[PDB]
Design a protein around this ligand. Structure first.
Ligand code: ZNH
Ligand code: FE2
Ligand code: FE2
Length: 153
């Protein structure tokens, strides 16, 4: 459980992400795929894209990153009160996409890196700490939902 001030830091930087959701979602995917290529393989419909510029040019990839980050933003705005939003996400990710919690860790790392690289003046140590705690809470709770579904993430 985060403090009110930690939530405010998370939502303040999130409002910066919302100025360009598509571009942040591209950058986070490209960082994730470069850092951890197995994660590209899980995105079965995007495995063909060869370079960063091919990734940025893909409308399908851009639209997917907006869907992904819109769901995360809706979860963060609930300030931990997110069972209703988490539930369907855990269902699809445990049963259809088969995303292990470790890959949620990898993308949390990519989110922190991209937020820091785009917004350093609004994402210092305290905001980083608050976003880390927010994403750790998301991962803990989605891992409990995975188990409810019979999936060990
Ligand atoms: C932050 C965190 C996160 C979030 C919020 C999300 C969200 C999301 C959403 C909303 C969607 C749509 C719906 C469904 O479910 O299906 C998706 C899809 C999705 N997903 Zn995911 N995710 C994520 C992570 C992820 C990761 C990490 C991975 C890998 C690795 C993934 C993989 C995925 C896939 C593969 C899909 C499908 C895509 C297409 O369309 O193709 N995922 N996703
Ligand atoms: Fe592989
Ligand atoms: Fe994705």
């Amino acid at each position: 459980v985060l403090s009110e001030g930690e939530w405010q830091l998370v939502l303040h930087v999130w409002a910066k992400v919302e100025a360009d959701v598509a571009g942040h979602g591209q950058d986070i995917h490209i960082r994730l795929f470069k850092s951890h290529p197995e994660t590209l393989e899980k995105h079965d419909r995007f495995k063909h894209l060869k370079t960063e510029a091919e990734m940025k040019a893909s409308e399908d990839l851009k639209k997917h990153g907006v869907t992904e980050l819109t769901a995360l933003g809706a979860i963060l705005k609930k300030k931990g009160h997110h069972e209703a939003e988490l539930k369907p996400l855990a269902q699809s990710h445990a049963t259809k996409h088969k995303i292990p919690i470790k890959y949620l860790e990898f993308i949390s790392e990519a989110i922190i890196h991209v937020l820091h690289s785009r917004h350093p003046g609004d994402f210092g140590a305290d905001a980083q700490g608050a976003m880390n705690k927010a994403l750790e809470l998301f991962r803990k709770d989605i891992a409990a939902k995975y188990k409810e579904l019979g999936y060990q993430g």
